[PDB]
Amino acid sequence: QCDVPPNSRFDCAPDKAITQEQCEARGCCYIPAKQGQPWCFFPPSYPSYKLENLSSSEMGYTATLTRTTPTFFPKDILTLRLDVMMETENRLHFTIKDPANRRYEVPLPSPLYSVEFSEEPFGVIVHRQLDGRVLLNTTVAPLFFADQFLQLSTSLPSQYITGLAEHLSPLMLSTSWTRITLWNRDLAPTPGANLYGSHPFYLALEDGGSAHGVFLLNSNAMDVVLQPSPALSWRSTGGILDVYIFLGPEPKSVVQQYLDVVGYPFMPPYWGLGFHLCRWGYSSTAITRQVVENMTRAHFPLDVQWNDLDYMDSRRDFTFNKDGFRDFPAMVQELHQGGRRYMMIVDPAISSSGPAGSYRPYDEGLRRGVFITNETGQPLIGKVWPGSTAFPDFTNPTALAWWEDMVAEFHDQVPFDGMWIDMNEPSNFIRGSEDGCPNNELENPPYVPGVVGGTLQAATICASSHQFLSTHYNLHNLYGLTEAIASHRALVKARGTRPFVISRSTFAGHGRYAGHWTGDVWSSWEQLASSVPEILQFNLLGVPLVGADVCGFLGNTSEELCVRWTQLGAFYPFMRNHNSLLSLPQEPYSFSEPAQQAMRKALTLRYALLPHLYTLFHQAHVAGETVARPLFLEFPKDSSTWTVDHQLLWGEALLITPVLQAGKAEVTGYFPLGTWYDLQTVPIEALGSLREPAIHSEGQWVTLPAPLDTINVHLRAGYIIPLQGPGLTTTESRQQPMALAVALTKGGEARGELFWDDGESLEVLERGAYTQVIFLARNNTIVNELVRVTSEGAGLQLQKVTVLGVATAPQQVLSNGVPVSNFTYSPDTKVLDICVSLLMGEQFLVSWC
Numbered sequence: 008q009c010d011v012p013p014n015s016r017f018d019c020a021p022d023k024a025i026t027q028e029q030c031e032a033r034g035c036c037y038i039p040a041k042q043g044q045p046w047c048f049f050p051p052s053y054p055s056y057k058l059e060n061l062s063s064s065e066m067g068y069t070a071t072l073t074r075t076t077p078t079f080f081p082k083d084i085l086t087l088r089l090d091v092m093m094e095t096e097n098r099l100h101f102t103i104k105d106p107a108n109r110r111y112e113v114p115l116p117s118p119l120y121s122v123e124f125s126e127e128p129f130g131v132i133v134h135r136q137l138d139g140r141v142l143l144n145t146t147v148a149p150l151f152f153a154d155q156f157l158q159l160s161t162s163l164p165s166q167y168i169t170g171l172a173e174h175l176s177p178l179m180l181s182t183s184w185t186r187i188t189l190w191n192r193d194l195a196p197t198p199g200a201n202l203y204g205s206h207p208f209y210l211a212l213e214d215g216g217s218a219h220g221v222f223l224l225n226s227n228a229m230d231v232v233l234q235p236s237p238a239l240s241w242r243s244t245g246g247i248l249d250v251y252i253f254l255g256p257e258p259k260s261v262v263q264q265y266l267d268v269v270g271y272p273f274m275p276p277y278w279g280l281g282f283h284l285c286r287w288g289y290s291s292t293a294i295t296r297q298v299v300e301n302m303t304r305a306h307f308p309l310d311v312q313w314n315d316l317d318y319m320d321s322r323r324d325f326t327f328n329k330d331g332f333r334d335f336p337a338m339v340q341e342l343h344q345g346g347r348r349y350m351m352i353v354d355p356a357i358s359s360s361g362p363a364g365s366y367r368p369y370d371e372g373l374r375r376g377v378f379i380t381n382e383t384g385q386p387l388i389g390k391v392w393p394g395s396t397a398f399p400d401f402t403n404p405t406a407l408a409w410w411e412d413m414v415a416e417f418h419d420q421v422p423f424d425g426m427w428i429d430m431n432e433p434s435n436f437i438r439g440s441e442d443g444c445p446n447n448e449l450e451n452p453p454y455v456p457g458v459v460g461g462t463l464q465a466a467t468i469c470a471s472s473h474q475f476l477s478t479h480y481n482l483h484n485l486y487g488l489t490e491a492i493a494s495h496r497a498l499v500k501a502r503g504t505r506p507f508v509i510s511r512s513t514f515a516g517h518g519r520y521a522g523h524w525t526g527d528v529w530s531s532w533e534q535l536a537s538s539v540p541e542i543l544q545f546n547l548l549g550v551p552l553v554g555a556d557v558c559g560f561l562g563n564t565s566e567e568l569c570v571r572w573t574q575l576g577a578f579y580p581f582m583r584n585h586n587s588l589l590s591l592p593q594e595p596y597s598f599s600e601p602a603q604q605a606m607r608k609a610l611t612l613r614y615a616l617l618p619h620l621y622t623l624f625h626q627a628h629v630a631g632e633t634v635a636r637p638l639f640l641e642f643p644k645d646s647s648t649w650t651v652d653h654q655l656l657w658g659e660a661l662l663i664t665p666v667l668q669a670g671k672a673e674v675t676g677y678f679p680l681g682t683w684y685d686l687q688t689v690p691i692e693a694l695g696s697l698r699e700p701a702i703h704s705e706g707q708w709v710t711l712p713a714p715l716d717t718i719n720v721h722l723r724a725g726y727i728i729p730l731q732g733p734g735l736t737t738t739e740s741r742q743q744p745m746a747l748a749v750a751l752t753k754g755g756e757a758r759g760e761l762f763w764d765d766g767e768s769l770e771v772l773e774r775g776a777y778t779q780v781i782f783l784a785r786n787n788t789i790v791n792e793l794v795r796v797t798s799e800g801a802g803l804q805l806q807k808v809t810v811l812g813v814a815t816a817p818q819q820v821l822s823n824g825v826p827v828s829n830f831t832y833s834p835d836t837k838v839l840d841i842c843v844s845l846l847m848g849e850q851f852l853v854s855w856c
């Protein structure tokens with residue numbers, strides 16, 4: 008009766024350390040491990056819920072779940088309602104609720120699946136129809152459903168699972184008794200800790216390269232426990248079970264299906280894709296001006312200048328000091344005149360200690376009741392940068408209106424172009440509030456997940472504090488998201504163009520409103536390597552605008568690290584070099600000449616690829632694609648890709664293989680079956696100063712030369728990449744002529760596309776205010792296909808076409824039937840470089856033979 012294989016034992020004492028006698032008193036089995044694995048675990052006979060009165064609606068199924076025997080947790084809910092909705096052929100949805108009490112809910116020719124049910128103990132069983140494989144089986148363990156404790160378990164189809172941000176972890180999560188805690192927390196990224204965001208979604212790989220996704224729409228603090236059987240357990244501290252299963256079958260389709268629910272990523276302004284430079288310690292407008300001066304002097308592109316707490320008056324939002332920032336508005340106006348943009352930090356917490364009538368944001372907040380309140384109904388007061396602070400309630404409609412006003416009013420003073428929203432966990436320098444926290448079940452729940460500090464209050468506000476929609480206990484994981492939403496709306500109203508919001512704390516669906524950076528990472532090799540899986544993870548979760556502080560934030564960077572970090576960083580979708588107050592400088596211009604070359608080259612390449620990167624974001628926005636993706640998302644059927652997370656793809660075509668260790672002059676990367684052209688063979692122009700031509704892989708690891716000044720970038724055969732000429736800003740580069748890089752298959756074919764708009768307007772797709780072109784290479788010709796042409800893309804000039812993998816030197820190269828003025832061919836590299844005078848918006852035919 009206690010004969011359960013070790014790896015299939017489910018913890019019967021997740022709440023406390025337990026003795027044998029107590030374990031058996033709970034009706035559980037006690038077997039000590041031989042070396043983690045629970046000593047106290049459920050027998051197959053442990054009391055669960057029983058399914059009864061299962062019936063058939065038009066949507067799917069409904070049933071009653073009854074528990075006869077109470078668990079060891081208080082306030083078991085003995086009668087539940089089951090609703091199974093078969094929403095699409097790709098998406099199955101089921102809820103388990105209390106029919107007697109409305110509980111907290113997060114405010115949001117055949118199907119590929121089939122569903123069965125176990126009667127006793129109750130379980131939901133989901134099969135993939137095509138191959139009969141069990142994806143979900145909740146029978147593996149008892150269902151717990153108490154007021155402050157939900158537990159739902161399932162078998163997993165393989166050892167390969169990804170998701171459940173935000174943690175410093177490999178892309179593929181360890182199934183060796185791993186406890187993953189989702190509770191937004193201000194902590195410098197470290198393994199085994201709950202970090203800034205919570206995304207209750209996983210993608211699971213199945214033998215053969217199929218995949219499915221599971222999303223649990225629950226914003227309460229939770230643990231997810233993985234075991235090697237393999238299996239998974241959700242343990243939430245409130246709410247309901249609201250489960251979506253996405254059937255794929257392709258990993259890309261899983262992501263797309265998940266984003267159908269949580270929302271497709273927002274479309275950033277083009278300039279957002281440029282280089283961002285920031286640090287804490289630009290303490291004046293004069294110093295800040297020097298940063299732009301020094302970058303321009305040394306031919307480093309810079310699109311956006313940022314400021315941290317420096318700009319503020321006494322570290323308060325919506326103010327500027329009259330010392331080093333007396334002429335703040337003029338500085339920002341000047342940046343605009345140069346064709347650049349400005350970003351500055353904004354905290355959620357509002358200074359409450361000022362004299363009445365002297366600080367409008369607090370005074371208005373007080374008047375309108377925008378703050379999170381405590382037991383007696385007064386604002387909850389914590390400590391942050393300005394000192395004593397109240398925290399806005401972003402679930403309050405009135406709070407949203409107040410936030411819009413503060414942003415609009417401040418924008419009238421200083422025309423910033425976006426918002427960097429930090430500390431939105433929300434972060435608190437003290438535990439709970441200045442007045443401590445009350446003694447109640449929200450503050451001391453029966454189950455506390457493995458959060459750092461061992462309490463839900465650590466580094467945040469009281470769980471039992473009041474918001475418009477609910478207690479903080481339920482809403483905590485949404486705090487950052489709600490601020491993102493609030494900020495997104497505020498910037499739209501204030502500016503009338505696309506918002507640019509970068510947020511620290513995030514939740515499922517965050518990517519629809521804002522981007523993210525991975526927080527206070529150390530300037531270390533370890534942290535540089537870790538950023539790749541982290542960036543990839545966020546793409547899978549539909550937050551494609553993500554990156555890490557290039558060169559690292561905490562500690563002092565080295566020259567070598569900063570070179571490697573910039574090399575890889577240029578391939579973060581969101582690229583910002585940011586630095587801490589006490590750190591040594593790490594701006595590109597602050598290093599030696601050889602190092603500057605390497606960095607200049609990385610920034611040059613990025614700027615060249617912006618038209619491509621922008622098109623990739625367009626795909627994310629309309630079709631729920633990823634921008635930076637792991638090999639396994641592009642090559643699921645090659646199981647060698649499954650554990651690759653130190654390389655990344657941009658879209659389908661561009662494979663980046665970075666050096667992530669000190670003193671390395673080579674890198675070993677994995678190349679899926681196909682031909683991969685070295686991007687070094689494509690001519691790229693720069694403003695300042697700055698190997699096999701092709702890899703023919705059978706699906707194998709390849710060692711590549713990787714000297715200090717090189718980052719390995721390969722273009723997949725059969726793909727056409729659009730490029731644009733150089734500039735120090737996107738204002739400049741968007742005016743430059745364009746080029747094509749054409750990577751021919753052995754069969755002489757290739758396909759590509761370009762999306763183009765004004766780069767900042769709202770409702771571009773709805774209004775049709777864009778140009779969309781497809782490029783096709785076939786039978787020794789390159790043509791364009793006009794999907795849509797408007798004034799926006801009309802005057803785009805194509806002046807250069809580079810063809811990779813041309814076997815023999817041509818005798819004639821024609822453009823629209825006339826010999827071109829100039830072309831070159833390398834017998835060595837197999838590259839045909841053609842000069843042309845064409846318009847992206849007019850049909851052309853380039854040919855050779």
Ligand SMILES: *[C@@H]1O[C@H](CO)[C@@H](O[C@@H]2O[C@H](CO)[C@@H](O[C@@H]3O[C@H](CO)[C@@H](O)[C@H](O)[C@@H]3O)[C@H](O)[C@H]2NC(C)=O)[C@H](O)[C@H]1NC(C)=O
Nearest residue numbers: 051052123125127128130132141143144145146147148162
């Ligand atoms: C979903 O998971 C449940 C629980 O893991 C599975 O049901 C369980 O299957 C085991 C092992 O296959 C059963 O034990 C076996 O019973 C048979 C018939 O009496 C016997 O011939 C075997 O020697 C073995 O002892 C167990 O009774 C059963 N437990 C429950 C709770 O029903 C189920 O297989 C999974 N469903 C699918 C479709 O994978």
Ligand SMILES: *[C@@H]1O[C@H](CO)[C@@H](O[C@@H]2O[C@H](CO)[C@@H](O[C@@H]3O[C@H](CO)[C@@H](O)[C@H](O)[C@@H]3O)[C@H](O)[C@H]2NC(C)=O)[C@H](O)[C@H]1NC(C)=O
Nearest residue numbers: 359380381382383384385386387388395440442443444445
């Ligand atoms: C809910 O939040 C409010 C603030 O919005 C809390 O009010 C605080 O109450 C404490 C005492 O209960 C006050 O401290 C007092 O300070 C004076 C000197 O200034 C001293 O004479 C007293 O001995 C006492 O230490 C505190 O000033 C006050 N905070 C503010 C900003 O007014 C309230 O306690 C919170 N409610 C609960 C039950 O948590």
Ligand SMILES: *[C@@H]1O[C@H](CO[C@@H]2O[C@@H](C)[C@@H](O)[C@@H](O)[C@@H]2O)[C@@H](O[C@@H]2O[C@H](CO)[C@@H](O)[C@H](O)[C@H]2NC(C)=O)[C@H](O)[C@H]1NC(C)=O
Nearest residue numbers: 057058059060061062070071072073074085086087088106
């Ligand atoms: C399972 O259902 C039975 C019968 O429920 C009736 O028919 C259903 C389709 C639904 O429309 C119900 O509202 C109906 O009552 C339940 O047993 C009945 O309970 C009712 C109301 O308390 C009682 O008056 C009758 O005597 C019962 N009828 C029969 C034939 O048993 C039963 O409680 C349900 N099970 C659970 C655990 O919810």
Ligand SMILES: *[C@@H]1O[C@H](CO[C@@H]2O[C@@H](C)[C@@H](O)[C@@H](O)[C@@H]2O)[C@@H](O[C@@H]2O[C@H](CO)[C@@H](O)[C@H](O)[C@H]2NC(C)=O)[C@H](O)[C@H]1NC(C)=O
Nearest residue numbers: 529530531560561562563564565587588589590591592593
């Ligand atoms: C990061 O470096 C600063 C400064 O480092 C010094 O100056 C650099 C140019 C380099 O040459 C270093 O080797 C020098 O040590 C560190 O701040 C120093 O801290 C020490 C000891 O705590 C203190 O005695 C010095 O006065 C500080 N130096 C100055 C001029 O401010 C800082 O500690 C380093 N940070 C970390 C975590 O490594």
Ligand SMILES: *[C@@H]1O[C@H](CO)[C@@H](O[C@@H]2O[C@H](CO)[C@@H](O)[C@H](O)[C@H]2NC(C)=O)[C@H](O)[C@H]1NC(C)=O
Nearest residue numbers: 293294295296297298299300301592594596597
């Ligand atoms: C921008 O560049 C200038 C010039 O390189 C920097 O100012 C110099 O800093 C050195 C110390 O390293 C001082 O000894 C000199 O007085 C400065 N030289 C000149 C020509 O002024 C400046 O620090 C840089 N500013 C920023 C913000 O990076």
Ligand SMILES: CCCCC[C@]1(CO)NC[C@H](O)[C@@H](O)[C@@H]1O
Nearest residue numbers: 287315316352429511526527587
């Ligand atoms: C406690 C020292 C770190 C504070 C650093 C800052 C100051 O605003 N707040 C946290 C952010 O993640 C950092 O990017 C930011 O520079």
Ligand SMILES: [Cl-]
Nearest residue numbers: 025026027028
């Ligand atoms: Cl014991």
Ligand SMILES: [Cl-]
Nearest residue numbers: 029032033079
């Ligand atoms: Cl007990």
Ligand SMILES: [Cl-]
Nearest residue numbers: 110111476477
């Ligand atoms: Cl509620």
Ligand SMILES: [Cl-]
Nearest residue numbers: 166179180181
């Ligand atoms: Cl693994």
Ligand SMILES: [Cl-]
Nearest residue numbers: 343422423502
């Ligand atoms: Cl403006």
Ligand SMILES: [Cl-]
Nearest residue numbers: 474475476477
């Ligand atoms: Cl309400």
Ligand SMILES: [Cl-]
Nearest residue numbers: 646647648708
């Ligand atoms: Cl292998």
Ligand SMILES: [Cl-]
Nearest residue numbers: 675676708709
């Ligand atoms: Cl290897």
Ligand SMILES: [Cl-]
Nearest residue numbers: 716717718719
């Ligand atoms: Cl390079």
